[PDB]
Amino acid sequence: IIKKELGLEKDDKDAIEEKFRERLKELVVPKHVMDVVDEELSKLGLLDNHSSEFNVTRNYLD
Amino acid sequence: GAESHELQDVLEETNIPKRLYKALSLLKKEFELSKLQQRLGREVEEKIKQTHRKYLLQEQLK
């Protein structure tokens, strides 16, 4: 049921969640960044997308 | 709601057809202005309701 238009998903946040996940897939990477990125992505998803602080978070994740 | 200059111009008209046509044009102009305001509003409420629905969908996902 989650699968919808989800304008929120249309604002590249999925490209912050799924695209970055697959980019991270090919990376032999330790656990500290795992927990950090999981927490940051949870905070991003729990909130909106447009505001400037989310642009800051997006640039940091990039 | 036309400006007083439009009223003065209508008064300056002498022939009844001219005055009536200018009054009809002013009616149409006011109609267009009101419709433009109504459209801009209605779309603004639509998109703000869609933002509140973004939050609602976030809550449903939660």
Swiss-Prot record, chain A:
Localization recorded for this chain is: Mitochondrion matrix
Q: Which family does it belong to?
A: Belongs to the peptidase S16 family.
Q: What organism, scientifically named, is this protein from?
A: Homo sapiens
What's its job? ATP-dependent serine protease that mediates the selective degradation of misfolded, unassembled or oxidatively damaged polypeptides as well as certain short-lived regulatory proteins in the mitochondrial matrix. Endogenous substrates include mitochondrial steroidogenic acute regulatory (StAR) protein, DELE1, helicase Twinkle (TWNK) and the large ribosomal subunit protein MRPL32/bL32m. MRPL32/bL32m is protected from degradation by LONP1 when it is bound to a nucleic acid (RNA), but TWNK is not. May also have a chaperone function in the assembly of inner membrane protein complexes.
Quaternary assembly: Homohexamer. Organized in a ring with a central cavity. The ATP-binding and proteolytic domains (AP-domain) form a hexameric chamber, while the N-terminal domain is arranged as a trimer of dimers. DNA and RNA binding is stimulated by substrate and inhibited by ATP binding. Interacts with TWNK and mitochondrial DNA polymerase subunit POLG.
Q: Domain text from the record?
A: The Lon N-terminal domains are crucial for the overall structure of the protein, maintaining it in a conformation allowing its proper functioning. The AP-domain (ATP-binding and proteolytic domains) has a closed-ring conformation in the presence of AMP-PNP and its N-terminal entry gate appears closed. Upon ADP binding, it switches to a lock-washer conformation and its N-terminal gate opens.
Name of the gene: LONP1
Q: So which disease is it linked with?
A: CODAS syndrome: A rare syndrome characterized by the combination of cerebral, ocular, dental, auricular, and skeletal features. These include developmental delay, craniofacial anomalies, cataracts, ptosis, median nasal groove, delayed tooth eruption, hearing loss, short stature, delayed epiphyseal ossification, metaphyseal hip dysplasia, and vertebral coronal clefts.
**Annotated tissue distribution:** Duodenum, heart, lung and liver, but not thymus.
This protein is called Lon protease homolog, mitochondrial
